[PDB]
């Protein structure tokens, strides 16, 4: 009986993966794509900024008395080129390592989950049917206490085997469904951890490049008196 | 004579500020605007990403056996909200503190530099003219050795005073022009240093938020065997 409760729970996990998880995953992939289209816009415009800033650098470089401000501006653009390319690194961790691999799994998963649920439903119904029918055969013999005929005991053995088989099937089927769910969330968490490690390397790079060059830049226009 | 060389150098510095520096600065302001329009695109799309990621979080949260993966995904979105808002901080250091103040100075500088150069040109020509004319008056007396009349010596004193006045005027005018140039590059370098300090605080924030949470995230789907 708790068997039937478990059977419905199992059906519900497959339905939850197919109608909630995978569509939400489709949406997450679409946001990721938008995000990367945006991030490309910002990389590009960062370019035009830092070229316009090297232009001002070239002008100072050619003057009397502001040459080292020319150097400062060159270095600010350079620091940004180094920071940017630690960002373009995090960016491809995003495309090849996250968006592509999610798209690849979710594509195959439609067929895979429709087939698994269906195979499970068929097997569970076929074991249920065979059990009910053994039980009916027995109820027939038994209708027309501590006494069993040879054939009654054979039916008893068979019902006991099929009932054990059915309960194990439903028990394992439930564990397997919960494991299918956890795998899909684990993979998602893993792909996010990998982009994260690259965000950490990008932010660490920026801190140390700036920590290096900023105090010299702040000194360039200080009172020398 | 080296006076005339210095006079032309001075004219050239004002021409360089008005025809090279300020137009390049106009262009830099336009790139900065584009850059900030882009950066707004990326902040927005980062939003849609991290909402789609909280959605996946909510799903794990409601399951049997993947709840703590729900927590992990919540924390990844949270870390991103904290990183983003240290970025929105660097962003307004960019708008109110850099783009606005550059636009404000370059607006008034057109009139200011046209007027300064012009005032200088007029004063320098007026001192030159007066000197030449004193000198001609003297050459007249002197035409029709170690002998000077009272009036010849008075002209000599006056020429010497005007010539000293002219040379100081050109000498100071050159120093002042080079100082006008250096001020405009200094201000530019200062506004960039201020945005930089905020980039440093944004990258430092990201490093430490990730340093904190990443190892727990990497543990969430490890073999427990």
């Amino acid at each position: 009986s708790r068997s039937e409760e478990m059977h419905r729970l199992t059906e519900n996990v497959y339905k939850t993966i197919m109608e909630q998880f995978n569509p939400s995953l489709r949406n997450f992939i679409a946001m990721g794509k938008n995000y990367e289209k945006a991030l490309a816009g910002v990389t590009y415009a960062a370019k035009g900024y830092f070229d316009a800033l090297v232009k001002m650098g070239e002008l100072a470089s050619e003057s009397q008395g502001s040459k080292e401000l020319g150097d400062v501006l060159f270095q600010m653009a350079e620091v940004h080129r180094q920071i940017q390319n630690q960002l373009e690194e995090m960016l491809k961790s995003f495309h090849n390592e996250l968006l592509t691999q999610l798209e690849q799994k979710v594509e195959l998963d439609s067929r895979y989950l429709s087939a698994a649920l269906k195979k499970y439903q068929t097997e569970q119904r076929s074991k249920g049917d065979a059990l009910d029918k053994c039980q009916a055969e027995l109820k027939k013999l038994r209708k027309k206490p501590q006494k069993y005929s040879d054939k009654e005991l054979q039916y008893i053995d068979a019902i006991s085997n099929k009932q054990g088989e059915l309960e194990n099937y439903v028990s394992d089927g439930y564990k397997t469904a919960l494991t299918e769910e956890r795998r899909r969330f684990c993979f998602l968490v893993e792909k996010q951890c990998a982009v994260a490690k690259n965000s950490a390397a990008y932010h660490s790079k920026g801190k140390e490049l700036l920590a290096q060059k900023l105090p010299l830049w702040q000194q360039a226009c200080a009172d020398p008196s | 004579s080296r006076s005339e060389e210095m006079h032309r150098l001075t004219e050239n510095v004002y021409k360089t500020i008005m025809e090279q520096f300020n137009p390049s600065l106009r262009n830099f302001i336009a790139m900065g605007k584009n850059y900030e329009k882009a950066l707004a695109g990326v902040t927005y799309a980062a939003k849609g990403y991290f909402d789609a990621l909280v959605k996946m979080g909510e799903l794990a949260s409601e399951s049997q056996g993947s709840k703590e993966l729900g927590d992990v995904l919540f924390q990844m979105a949270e870390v991103h909200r904290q990183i983003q808002n240290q970025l929105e901080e660097m962003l307004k250091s960019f708008h109110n503190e850099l783009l606005t103040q550059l636009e404000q100075k370059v607006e008034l500088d057109s009139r200011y530099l046209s007027a300064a150069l012009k005032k200088y040109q007029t004063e320098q020509r007026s001192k030159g003219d007066a000197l030449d004319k004193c000198q001609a008056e003297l050459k007249k007396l002197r035409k029709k050795p170690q002998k000077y009349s009272d009036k010849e010596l008075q002209y000599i004193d006056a020429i010497s005073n005007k010539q000293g006045e002219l040379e100081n005027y050109v000498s100071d005018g050159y120093k002042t022009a080079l100082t006008e140039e250096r001020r405009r590059f200094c201000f530019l370098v200062e506004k960039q240093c201020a945005v930089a300090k905020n980039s440093a605080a944004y990258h430092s924030k990201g490093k430490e938020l990730l340093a904190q949470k990443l190892p727990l995230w990497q543990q969430a789907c490890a073999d427990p065997s």
């Binding site: 690849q104 594509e107 195959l108 895979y112 195979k119 795998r183 684990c186 | 789907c221 490890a222 073999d223």
Partner: peptide, 12 residues
């Protein structure tokens, strides 16, 4: 030929 799980080798 039954259908292969796209997540077969994902550790939990």
């Amino acid at each position: 030929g039954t259908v292969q799980n796209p997540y077969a080798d994902v550790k939990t």
